[PDB]
């Protein structure tokens, strides 16, 4: 009570938020690419420098942002994706908090360059200072958006110390893009590090090509396609033969909830109870769960790392049977 | 882009935040009690009804809130605990985001009644409506604060469905109070459910009494006191004989970082590598880690469930040796 209850300064409040949603450079790449995805992009170019500690650039060929909404694109709690509780409990987009760009801007030097098909001119914008004041100025750019995040954590020096080696940090970025590339086979994604191209995923409107290109040939050889459907619950993807799964292959344990990369304990357990009951070790897989958004809650973690299902036992059993069925 | 980028309505934005910090009634109890603790309370009375789905009342004998700051006590991003980045990287209080009361208010009917030693009159306040407008009116109350949360999730009906049985929900509350009672032996804490008193922890200025009263006699009998200190790192608490630890006793695996109930994987692993190397199963313990706030980061999860240590390997090894030493 010595200190008066007071509203935190805009930048500091955003930095507090940034600590919860932006752990490392990979986290920045994750949010910006998901933004690009929500914008209907079909091609995404990601340029990384020094593990992302120096620069993180993401360009997409999405619908872009309107000149008079760029500042809103950087303001707290501002979003174009949802506008009510009804929209929230029926999420149909990767973003919905309207916080990512604001959090990231407060902990780096972020620039937003964009143009819409209806605009003849392009514009760039950036927040700045204790009050996160926004500047919008002229620019040259194609229809679409380019995000530039430089000096990550430069104003929160203590967080930078948690940064691992550049190589390590890039590996986490590379892993994120992997997870995202598996989520959207229809999107072309190019990733470069230090001027050199590391990968270029080709869009698929046979996914076997990309699957192998992303997870390796080893997985593709052991991969068993899945097609499981009940009421409105659907399970797709691939599961490897437990008897022919190695520790290396076990590093591939990806699951998605309505196209959103998730890491659910309920899902993994269901999948294991199936490989255990059959084999009689750690399974390798790439599963996609499709469900009515009303039956799942994705507003549990600020980074969307978790989800909770309204009918927990029903969903678990659905995946169990689904996997178990394929193994036989 | 069909929908314009727009600032979310105050209540909805808070509800989005509430989904990340307030999972269940126990979560509400956690935040409010921590508030009471930060306020210097030495006695805290918690009245619960129907698992907390009906009512959650917390009264403390802390310093209270100033009349002209009650609305600020409910506004977003408003706090009296920190005011700069320097304060953030040196956290010395349980709260610091200035968000809890605002999140909780948007998902229930919350009332704040309080009075300071300098005030002759008491006042109560509550946020309300889409814009979370605040009302402050006269009231009768001792020096201290009373929080009343009724109808949890009444305006977010879908979240209420995730509510388990009243008995189950109260058990999670009971567990939280347990963890908190172990964190502050010097605080009297009374917990009641449906008019009936469930427990009453007595303040200690020999902690063995409370320890037994909280974790059971079984633990007290197997408990081995710890006193480990290095540079500024300190480890205190109790660890049970692995050879004499049962699954029931394994349910007691509590650890604290600067008095804050945490569940760190680094800490648990270090503790296990010690019981493994000695015994040659799951250990039972109550450990307290004291460290310079600059060496730890507690701004990782909106609920403060996690932390990251600047010198990870140093801390892990510190606890390993600490425990390992006691087992021998
Ligand atoms: N690459 C992009 N292309 C088009 N619009 C974008 C892009 N990045 C951001 N936006 C717009 O900026 C708004 C702000 O983005 P962001 O700050 O990430 O919040 P969000 O996507 O709404 N929700 P969240 O990520 O959950 O916090 C979005 O709602 C879009 O309307
Ligand atoms: N029981 C209480 N006694 C005295 N002051 C209180 C109490 N509960 C809340 N407050 C005051 O209200 C402010 C708001 O509380 P709260 O909304 O929980 O945010 P916080 O404690 O600052 N941070 P956080 O919990 O991390 O979001 C605090 O900073 C206190 O100054
Ligand atoms: Mg987003
Ligand atoms: Mg608090
Ligand atoms: Rb925004
Ligand atoms: Rb507040």
């Amino acid at each position: 009570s010595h200190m008066p209850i007071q509203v935190l300064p805009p930048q500091l409040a955003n930095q507090i938020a940034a600590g919860e949603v932006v752990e490392r450079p990979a986290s920045v790449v994750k949010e910006l690419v998901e933004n690009s995805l929500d914008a209907g992009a079909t091609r995404i170019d990601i340029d990384i420098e020094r593990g992302g500690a120096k620069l993180i650039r993401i360009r997409d060929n999405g619908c872009g942002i309107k000149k008079d909404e760029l500042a809103l694109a950087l303001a707290r709690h501002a979003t174009s994706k949802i506008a009510s509780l009804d929209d929230l409990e029926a999420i149909i987009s990767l973003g919905f908090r309207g916080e990512a760009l604001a959090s990231i801007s407060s902990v780096s030097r972020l620039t937003l360059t964009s143009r819409t098909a209806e605009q003849q001119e392009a514009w760039q914008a950036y927040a700045e200072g204790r009050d996160m004041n926004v500047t919008v100025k002229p620019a040259a750019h194609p229809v679409g958006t380019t995000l530039e995040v430089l000096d990550l954590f430069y104003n929160t020096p203590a967080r930078r110390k948690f940064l691992r080696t550049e190589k390590t940090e890039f590996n986490h970025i590379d892993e994120i893009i992997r997870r995202i590339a598996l989520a959207r086979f229809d999107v072309t994604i190019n990733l470069s590090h230090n001027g050199k191209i590391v990968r270029q995923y080709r869009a698929v409107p046979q996914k076997e090509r990309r699957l192998g290109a992303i997870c390796g040939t080893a997985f593709l050889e052991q991969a068993l396609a899945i097609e499981w459907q009940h009421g409105d619950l659907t399970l797709r993807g691939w599961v490897a033969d437990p008897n022919h799964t190695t520790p290396a292959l076990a590093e591939i344990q990806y699951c998605y909830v309505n196209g959103r990369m998730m890491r659910d304990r309920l899902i993994n357990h269901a999948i294991r109870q199936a490989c255990e009951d059959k084999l009689g070790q750690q399974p390798a897989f790439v599963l996609y769960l499709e469900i009515d958004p009303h039956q799942v809650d994705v507003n549990v973690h600020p980074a969307k790392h978790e989800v909770r299902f309204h009918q927990s036992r029903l969903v678990h059993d659905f995946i169990y049977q689904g996997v178990l069925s394929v193994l036989q």
Side-chain angles (χ1 to χ4, degrees), chain A residues 3 6-20 76-77 99 102-108 127-133 155-157 159:
Chain A
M3 276 166 76
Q6 209 159 59
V7 172
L8 291 162
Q11 180 167 66
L12 180 54
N14 281 290
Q15 298 180 318
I16 294 178
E20 303 161 358
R76 297 202 66 178
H77 321 299
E99 281 277 292
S103 294
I104 302 180
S105 294
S106 74
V107 297
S108 76
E128 168 178 56
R130 266 173 49 91
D131 291 70
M132 301 290 274
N133 299 308
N155 55 348
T156 51
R159 296 184 185 179

Side-chain angles (χ1 to χ4, degrees), chain A residues 92-199:
Chain A
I92 54 178
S93 62
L94 296 178
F96 63 81
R97 310 173 73 241
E99 281 277 292
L101 293 189
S103 294
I104 302 180
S105 294
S106 74
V107 297
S108 76
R109 312 246 70 156
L110 173 163
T111 303
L112 182 61
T113 305
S114 184
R115 179 164 78 76
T116 58
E118 300 70 52
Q119 289 175 187
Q120 206 86 50
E121 305 303 315
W123 307 85
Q124 66 171 190
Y126 56 78
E128 168 178 56
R130 266 173 49 91
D131 291 70
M132 301 290 274
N133 299 308
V134 173
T135 302
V136 175
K137 66 170 73 165
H141 192 280
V143 172
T145 306
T146 289
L147 259 302
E148 261 203 52
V149 179
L150 284 57
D151 275 53
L152 218 210
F153 305 137
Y154 82 102
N155 55 348
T156 51
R159 296 184 185 179
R160 198 153 57 180
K161 304 202 303 172
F162 286 106
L163 285 178
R164 274 279 149 180
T165 71
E166 288 169 35
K167 174 190 173 183
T168 305
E169 291 302 327
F170 180 71
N171 287 333
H172 282 79
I173 294 177
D174 188 35
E175 181 59 22
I176 278 291
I177 296 307
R178 200 126 56 196
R179 301 175 72 193
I180 287 169
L182 286 165
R184 294 293 298 285
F185 282 78
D186 63 314
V187 176
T188 292
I189 305 183
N190 297 313
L191 174 61
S192 296
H193 190 205
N194 295 320
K196 292 178 184 177
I197 189 169
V198 177
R199 42 205 63 191

Side-chain angles (χ1 to χ4, degrees), chain A residues 216-246:
Chain A
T217 301
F219 182 75
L220 185 55
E221 295 189 65
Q222 301 306 318
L224 299 174
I226 301 175
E227 297 177 4
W228 197 247
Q229 282 183 46
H230 184 69
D232 183 56
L233 286 181
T234 294
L235 182 68
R236 296 165 182 158
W238 302 268
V239 69
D241 194 316
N243 189 55
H244 294 78
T245 298
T246 63

Side-chain angles (χ1 to χ4, degrees), chain A residues 72-75 78 98-99:
Chain A
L72 284 162
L74 304 171
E99 281 277 292

Side-chain angles (χ1 to χ4, degrees), chain A residues 30-32 34-36 38 79 81 94-101 304:
Chain A
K30 181 274 198 180
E31 291 302 337
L32 305 187
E34 295 197 315
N35 277 339
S36 290
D38 292 331
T79 178
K81 299 165 186 183
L94 296 178
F96 63 81
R97 310 173 73 241
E99 281 277 292
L101 293 189
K304 299 129 189 166

